[PDB]
Design a protein around this ligand. Structure first.
Ligand SMILES: Nc1nc2c([nH]c(=O)n2[C@@H]2O[C@H](COP(=O)(O)OP(=O)(O)OP(=O)(O)O)[C@@H](O)[C@H]2O)c(=O)[nH]1
Ligand SMILES: Nc1nc2c([nH]c(=O)n2[C@@H]2O[C@H](COP(=O)(O)O)[C@@H](O)[C@H]2O)c(=O)[nH]1
Ligand SMILES: [Mg+2]
Length: 292
C-alpha cells in the first residue's frame, strides 16, 4: 500500500506522420517510455518534463494526459502517469542510464515497446489528436476561511500555504507552455498566478465575469467568456473560484463528449483542457501541488 510516484511521456515529433521516442535502459535491458520518479516537492507534470529531458535530451511541452500505469515493486506499488509531450528540441546522447533512443512511427513503436501497459498508453495517444492547444483552469490557492459576511471577501489574500501553492504552480503551468494569464476579480485569484506573471513578465487580465457572484447572476456570460478566452492564440491560464469551476468544466465536457479520467476541485488544483481545431479533446484534473 505504499506508492512510489512517477511520471513520464509519449514524446513525439513531426497522427501517422508522427514519430515517438522509445528508450533502452541497460540496467533492465528494457525498451520503454521515458519516465521517472517524482522528487520531493515535485508534481507529476514537472517530473514528466524533467525526466523526458534527463533521459532523452529533449525539452517538450506537455499536452493531453494519457492514463496511469501501476505495477508491483519491492517498495509497494509503482504508479506512473503519462502525458503526450511534443518535442521542442534537443539531442540524445547515450549513457549508462539510457543507451539508445529510437524515433519510430507508432506501429513500429508498438512492436518495440516490451511492456503491455506502455502499448496501452501508446494506444491512448493515437486515439485523439496530439497537436493540441491548452487552457489551464486553476482554482486559487488556500486563502484562510470565509468571513461571517455576505458574499465573498473580495480582498481576502492567500495564506502562507496558498502563497507556497502559487510559487509551486509556476513550474506546473510552465510544463504545459502557459503563455497568457487571466484571473477572476478577486485578490486571491490574482495572487495565485502572480508568481507565474513575474516569471513570464506578463500582465494578468482581470475577469469580473468569472467570479462566484457573477457566475451565480449570469452563468451564460461566464460560459461565453471562457470560450472567448480559449479561442485567443496562446495557452491561457484562467484562475477562478470553487463555485465556478466544476460547472464550467462539466458544461464543456458534456457539450464536447469528453470524459475526464479524474475529478476534483481543490484549492490550488488545475484542469488541463486540450483543444484540437478549437474542440475539447481532453480534460485532465491535477491535484494541488502540495497534495497527492
Ligand atoms: N519502465 C517500466 N518498467 C516496468 C514496467 N512494468 C514493470 O514491471 N517494469 C519493471 O519494473 C522494474 C523497476 O523499473 P522502473 O523503471 O519502474 O524503476 P526505476 O526506479 O529503476 O526507474 P524510474 O526512475 O524510471 O521509475 C524493472 O524491472 C522494470 O522492467 C513499466 O510499465 N515500465
Ligand atoms: N532488449 C530486450 N528486448 C525485449 C525484452 N523482452 C522483449 O519482449 N523484448 C522485445 O524484443 C525486441 C528487441 O530486441 P533487441 O534488438 O535484442 O533489443 C523488441 O520487440 C522488444 O520489445 C528484453 O528483456 N530485452
Ligand atoms: Mg526513468
Amino acid at each position: 500500500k505504499h506508492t512510489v510516484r512517477a511520471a513520464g511521456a509519449v514524446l513525439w515529433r513531426d497522427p501517422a506522420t508522427v514519430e515517438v521516442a522509445v528508450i533502452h535502459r541497460p540496467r533492465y535491458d528494457d525498451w520503454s517510455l521515458p519516465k521517472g520518479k517524482l522528487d520531493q516537492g515535485e508534481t507529476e507534470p514537472v517530473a514528466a518534463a524533467r525526466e523526458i529531458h534527463e533521459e532523452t535530451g529533449h525539452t517538450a511541452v506537455l499536452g493531453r494526459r494519457l492514463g496511469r500505469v501501476t505495477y508491483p515493486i519491492p517498495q509497494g506499488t509503482k504508479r506512473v502517469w503519462y502525458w503526450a509531450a511534443k518535442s521542442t528540441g534537443g539531442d540524445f546522447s547515450p549513457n549508462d542510464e539510457v543507451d539508445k533512443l529510437v524515433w519510430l512511427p507508432v506501429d513500429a513503436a508498438m512492436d518495440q515497446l516490451q511492456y503491455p501497459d506502455d502499448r496501452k498508453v501508446l494506444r491512448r495517444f493515437v486515439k485523439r489528436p496530439v497537436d493540441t492547444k491548452t487552457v489551464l483552469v486553476v482554482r486559487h490557492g488556500t486563502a484562510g476561511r470565509r468571513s461571517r459576511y455576505k458574499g465573498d471577501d473580495r480582498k481576502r489574500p492567500l495564506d502562507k500555504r496558498g502563497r507556497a501553492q502559487a510559487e509551486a504552480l509556476v513550474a506546473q503551468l510552465m510544463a504545459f507552455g502557459a503563455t497568457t494569464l487571466y484571473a477572476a476579480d478577486r485578490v486571491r485569484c490574482h495572487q495565485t498566478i502572480e508568481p507565474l506573471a513575474q516569471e513570464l513578465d506578463q500582465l494578468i487580465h482581470n475577469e469580473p465575469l468569472l467570479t462566484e457572484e457573477a457566475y451565480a447572476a449570469d452563468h451564460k456570460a461566464a460560459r461565453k467568456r471562457l470560450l472567448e478566452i480559449a479561442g485567443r492564440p496562446g495557452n491561457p491560464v484562467i484562475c477562478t473560484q470553487g463555485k465556478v469551476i466544476p460547472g464550467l468544466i462539466e458544461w464543456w465536457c458534456e457539450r464536447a463528449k469528453v470524459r475526464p479520467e479524474t475529478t476534483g476541485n481543490r484549492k490550488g488544483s488545475t484542469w488541463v483542457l486540450s483543444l484540437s481545431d478549437g474542440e475539447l479533446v481532453g480534460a485532465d484534473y491535477l491535484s494541488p501541488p502540495d497534495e497527492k
